Amino acid sequence: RKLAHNFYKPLAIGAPEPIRELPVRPERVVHFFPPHVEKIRARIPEVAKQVDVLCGNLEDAIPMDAKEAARNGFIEVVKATDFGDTALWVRVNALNSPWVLDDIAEIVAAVGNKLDVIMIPKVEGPWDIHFVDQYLALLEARHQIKKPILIHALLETAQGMVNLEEIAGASPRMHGFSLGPADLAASRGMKTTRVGGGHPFYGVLADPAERPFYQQDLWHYTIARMVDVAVAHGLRAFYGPFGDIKDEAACEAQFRNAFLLGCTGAWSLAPNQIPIAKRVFSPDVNEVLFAKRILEAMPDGSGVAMIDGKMQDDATWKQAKVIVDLARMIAKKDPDLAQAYGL
Amino acid sequence: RKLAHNFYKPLAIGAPEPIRELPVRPERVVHFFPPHVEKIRARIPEVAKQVDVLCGNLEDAIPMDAKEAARNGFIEVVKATDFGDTALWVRVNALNSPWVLDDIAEIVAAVGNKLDVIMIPKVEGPWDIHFVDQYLALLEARHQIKKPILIHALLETAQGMVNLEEIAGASPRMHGFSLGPADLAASRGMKTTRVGGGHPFYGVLADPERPFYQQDLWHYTIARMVDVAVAHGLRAFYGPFGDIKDEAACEAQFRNAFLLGCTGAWSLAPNQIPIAKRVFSPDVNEVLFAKRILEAMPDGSGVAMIDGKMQDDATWKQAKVIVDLARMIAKKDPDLAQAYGL
Amino acid sequence: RKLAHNFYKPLAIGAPEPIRELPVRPERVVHFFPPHVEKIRARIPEVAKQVDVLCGNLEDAIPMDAKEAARNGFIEVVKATDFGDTALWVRVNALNSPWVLDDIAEIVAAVGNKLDVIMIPKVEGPWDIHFVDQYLALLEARHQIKKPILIHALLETAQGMVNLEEIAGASPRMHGFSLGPADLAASRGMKTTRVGGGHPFYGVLADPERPFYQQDLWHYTIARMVDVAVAHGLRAFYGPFGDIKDEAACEAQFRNAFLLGCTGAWSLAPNQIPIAKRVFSPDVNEVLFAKRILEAMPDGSGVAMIDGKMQDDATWKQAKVIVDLARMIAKKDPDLAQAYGL
Amino acid sequence: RKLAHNFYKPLAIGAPEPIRELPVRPERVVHFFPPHVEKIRARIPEVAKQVDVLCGNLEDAIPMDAKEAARNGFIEVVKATDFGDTALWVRVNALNSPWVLDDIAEIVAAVGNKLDVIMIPKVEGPWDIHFVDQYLALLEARHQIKKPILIHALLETAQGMVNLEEIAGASPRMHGFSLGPADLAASRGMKTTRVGGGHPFYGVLADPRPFYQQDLWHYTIARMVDVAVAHGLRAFYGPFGDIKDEAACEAQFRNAFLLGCTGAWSLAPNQIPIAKRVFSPDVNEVLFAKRILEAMPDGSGVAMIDGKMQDDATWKQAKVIVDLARMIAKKDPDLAQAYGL
Amino acid sequence: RKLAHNFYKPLAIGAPEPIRELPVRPERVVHFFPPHVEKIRARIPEVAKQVDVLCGNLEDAIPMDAKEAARNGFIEVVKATDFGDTALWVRVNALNSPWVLDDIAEIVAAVGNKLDVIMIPKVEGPWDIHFVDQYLALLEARHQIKKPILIHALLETAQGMVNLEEIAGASPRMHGFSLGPADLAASRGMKTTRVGGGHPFYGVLADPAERPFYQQDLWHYTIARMVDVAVAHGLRAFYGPFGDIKDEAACEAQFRNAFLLGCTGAWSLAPNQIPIAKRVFSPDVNEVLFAKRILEAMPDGSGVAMIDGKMQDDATWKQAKVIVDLARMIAKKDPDLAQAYGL
């Protein structure tokens, strides 16, 4: 628990000033891609135009022999690509791995000024954050990175869920969390199906034709807790990978459940999940219109105002301010939503 | 959190001795009324006889040009009304609002001896409780209030849910928590259809037509609220249900709270009044069992075993609570009086 | 918490060295038996062969006038029986009862080397663990117990759930947790139709006859229990299911706990024995995947990758546990032996 | 720490109700004695009249073959002695020792209604207190002890000094702390020439040479007092080993007293009057407190004495120091007139 | 402790923005005066010209029948006086007294825009700070106070010393601490012969004519602990009152002991203590001359510099900046120190 007057200081001389609040931009879909596959690298400038954020993958589904080819491939394609409004993330290897050191160092050195958020696997405590925060700062100051590279934590273990508060407030670099269904289920010892997301035998048997069996959601406690901790710290919650690429119905349903609980976006591991994520995690229409009324009653966000019998202040205003700014950005690339939002 | 030998001490010279445990009384329904409306104000003495708890509202749905009127209005009825066995609460404005200072100060000064619980909107940390505690204490001393005015925390933000333990044990004034569904959903970013309800699209899709089983949005919230509240000797409450017209959903939602361990719920309309009282009335067989406990242990001392279960002091005090509670309800409900035998 | 270098030191001179990790063995079923009953006592050596864990009961459903005969009767049967591969547990009385002192002391004194785990009722805080840990150490050093006796915490209060993390990391004696549904629901104010069951009136009403989707009362509880236990290297157990004859609902409830990460459940009758064993037997596909991890990394060192997932120390020793557990079960079950390939 | 509404409840059924405040009584001197020595046991009924607190010792300086004799001898003399106004303490063996179980269990069983305070050696954390608290409660309930036996923590390790706040607020049984100089110095690696004393070579050298000796125990005692007082506990100076050096003994006792310590141990009859003389309540403080008790008849309302507002916390301490002075006045005629009680 | 992103927010709509760093100004002497006394009240414009800080007293040594007179007297003299460079404090009554509410409310209402710091007696925990913080914010918003009024905690109990960390980080209003010797000694059970002084009989007796008796300082632990907690949280530590007015020798020695341990200033209960405090707690000439070179080496305050073998960063530059500003302000009032400092 750092002191407030030390929390927002750069951890290295020449490192960029830590952020006071998260950058507002579309993050409905976190599209993953293997940077070592040449065919994939070829289409990256085209796919970048269809997604909110594009994320390079050096960890899972990346063979041990391809680790360096992935890192170099990532650096290669990023140097050549103008991502424009699409954000750039990268998931490096775990902190105990023999690749993570070169992963962060070589990438920040080469394409640090294009990198927005870095994803760290298997974050189990604030000590993990402390290392990465200090490590990035020294790398940022070294190569004159102009904007602080944010930290996205991947929740994969039982300990991670327990230490969620301490992780959330360990650094001003914190961006948010991603629920890793397959990894977390393996850690906890959950028996799920279809690489994480449910099990048809988890339900309630009714009292006595045949007794009704009402399936229940295995991930209620997990997401609910993830949202509360994240929101309280001004961070965003995300549903991670939905491994069952072919079941688009279960995918959209699972994505929707996350959205209804307060999640910002989800991962896509294939071209068919891109439109699903962008559709589900798009800001509610009525919610956008309501926030426009709030911004109109309060030009500065100063003073006291009441809308629909509800007192307004700086908190509700900044909040209305982010969702309108967000919706406007989405409207800029979606004529159909530009009409529905009036933005 | 304060030291044990300082926790139950008055925060002001003249302030009444803090309570050691919650006053036992019916709290199945907390009826909200707008004190600035003379028409509604005039019916208060008769409504009070219909509800367990009556709560004046100065906050939401009370216009900014009517705050002073709502405040002065509330003082007016309370001065002129004898509430009898009905508890008197009031929901003042937010701690950052330009109304809260005069709200608490003037109401305590005028009717502090009739006010039981004050409800604080948007409690997010123990620092909120600490302010209200010290502020009330100085006010109680100035006007010689005989009973300590308790504090009810309204949960409306994510931080409030996370800091629930710190809030619960921040003061001996703590009464309990009310879930503010609409406000909490807005804070978290929950997508919900109507206040107090859930969402039709939250559910589990069955494996490869595929059935769709709706889920409860508020399960985690109520469960955590109950656990924290009970552990600190407080009481958990379900807040407002915005759909007055839909009584079936209202009873179903109130029942979900009751089954998880909530004490009562809010009522915004007269049709919600009998619903809350019916749902949150103490379980009959549970009451009947506590009567055996109180009898096996008249003094409440020594060791006793009922149905193979050992009875210590903790279970006895719990049994004393529900039996007394059931009796105060049986006092004005001939049917429950029959079932309880009280 | 204690410092790391002190955490694994014995609390008494002559007390066995504290374990660094849980002893791996079948714990799918915890069969309870009243040691004061003679006809039950006689059939014990036979019942022991049919269960993974046999637990003597001195607490609930044991009359106060039979407490001593239960304690003595337990010592008698344990003395004359070689339980073999069956784990031996005992549930003593509550830490505030007038029996617990003689319970722990006399049992450890006589059969301490045959006792594996002691179940403590109503653990509410780390202080409870601290007493038993220090108490046991003094008793172990006195009678030269070679194996450290582990503590199994019974969760029966809301405060216990709130302090679950402090309880989990209070001692290396910690084995795991078991839910006490009848008590935990009483403490919370939860309404259940069965001990360890749910409630048919708890569910989501659909928007406009309106269908009613039942929900699980225990989702929050089990989920929190699992995360805390697993994080501290402990095992979470479901506990008892009241409705003995509802084997259908018994299996479903046991299954839900298993799917969430619970190691096993209690059995209150012979018919619940095969149900618990069937349900909590290690998932076939976890066993298979674990063997691939072990086959890939002989000594557990170095870096490897299975199905795209990097394997480290944590994954390896976790896989070592599963296979060892599956092998111990394969030994006494030919069907699972072929399914596991062990 | 436990929750406030649970903190003051008996930890066993039939156990006496936990105290809310420390019992007010003279504790200027804690006189130790070896209960196994029959010659000492014979004079105890008379020695008790000469000390504020009498504490039997089962731990240090008690041979391993005499541990059982000491425990039985203690029970024997306590049964035979009417202690009157003299407090009865006992220092059992360490919590890891093979004697502590029998020490606490058998003594409480036989003379639990005469035992006021147990001194526990080498208390390092709240866990130590949690065990003793729960263990005592079950023993108290079983033998129907009428008053809760308090716990006095011995500070003998660096860890104990670090976990002071956590040890203090871990139980309502907590009476206070005694400093254990020899063992604490050994734990820290501190160099002292005497048990309870400092070191002549610890000091400040002047600039170009006089050498100004410093007190090694300043930090330790100051920290102990703050933590104890904050929790409503009493801090004590432990044993002073150098029996013959009465000048240095009084100086060490006085240093502790000036910092806020309640009393000190006595390892020999000659230290008994020294502790009394030093740790007797200041006359001026007693007289000023009498003014408070007179100005505020019930302790309510708001008064002001010498330009200082008197609430309830100030009045409660005025009441404590006066009651304490009166009890001492009951057996010291010189202070009876000095205090005016 | 609050989260960093909520820590620096107004606690009320209309309340001024909380400070990020302590205002830099001469605080060597905090001169106490009784506002209920007429002749004192009439010389205030003259005395204020001779002190760094002027603090009105409503608490100790103020009779109960004079509480209202003192409160009104303070308000009247502040309204009529332009204090210029002199800071204005006030010590209201204890938080449990029947005078606190009126003390704070009426003063903020009438002279809130002239009040710099408010001193609270007997601060024992963060909860105390929490009340005053919120109370002030609601009063500041109501009366349009432009600058936030800071909180100065008086240490008078053993509990206060123990909870010193939680107190220091309880609010951005925190200015620092003052040691209250008579009250704290009474709480602890200490014995002193003078208010603020030690005790002759507290010392080390040398080994075996006469055995020498080396006197020891009673307040070493207290001041040392107070300084570490204060400095860590970016606060300032003050000695407080030295009750022995006559003994100027002991007063200066006692003030110096605080100054050598890092205390910013002390109270002056009498006109003869004013020049003593100003002389003692004036910034050391060596620190000013050296800290200037730091600013000289690195003007903007960034980059990597090295002075006398020691690396200079943001932390050291910021501390060097304040010591020169402080010295320059003092230079404006003292031509001797203006010569020594060179400012």
Numbering used by the authors:
A (entry chain D), E (entry chain C): 2 to 209, 214 to 348
B (entry chain E), C (entry chain F): 2 to 209, 215 to 348
D (entry chain B): 2 to 209, 216 to 348
Wording from the paper:
Malyl-CoA lyase (MCL) is a promiscuous carbon-carbon bond lyase that catalyzes the reversible cleavage of structurally related Coenzyme A (CoA) thioesters. Malyl-CoA lyases are promiscuous enzymes that accept a variety of substrates and can catalyze the reversible aldol condensation of CoA thioesters like acetyl-CoA or propionyl-CoA with 2-oxoacids like glyoxylate or pyruvate. The two MCLs share the common fold of a central TIM-barrel with small elaborations, as well as an additional C-terminal domain. In both cases the oligomeric state constitutes a dimer of trimers.
Subsequently it was discovered that in C. aurantiacus an MCL (MCLC) catalyzes three different steps in the 3-hydroxypropionate bi-cycle for autotrophic CO2 fixation. In the absence of substrates recombinant MCLC crystallized in the orthorhombic space group P 2 21 21 with one hexamer per asymmetric unit (AU). The crystals diffracted to a resolution of 2.5 Å and the structure was solved using the molecular replacement method. Only 4 to 6 residues were not built in a loop region (residues 210 – 215) of each chain due to the lack of sufficient electron density. As with other members of the CitE-like superfamily and malate synthases, the core of the MCLC monomer constitutes a β8/α8 TIM-barrel. In addition to the central TIM-barrel there is a C-terminal domain (starting at Phe287) that comprises three α-helices of which two are connected by a β-hairpin (residues 310–317). This C-terminal domain extends to the neighboring subunit. In both MCLC structures (with and without bound substrates) additional electron density was observed at the 3-fold rotation axis in each trimer and was modeled as Tris molecules. These form hydrogen bonds with the side chain amide oxygens of Gln221 in each subunit of the trimer, as well as with backbone oxygen atoms of Asp222. The Tris molecules are buried within the protein and do not appear to be solvent accessible, which may indicate that the additional insertion domain (residues 182–220) found after the sixth β-strand of the TIM-barrel is able to undergo a conformational change.
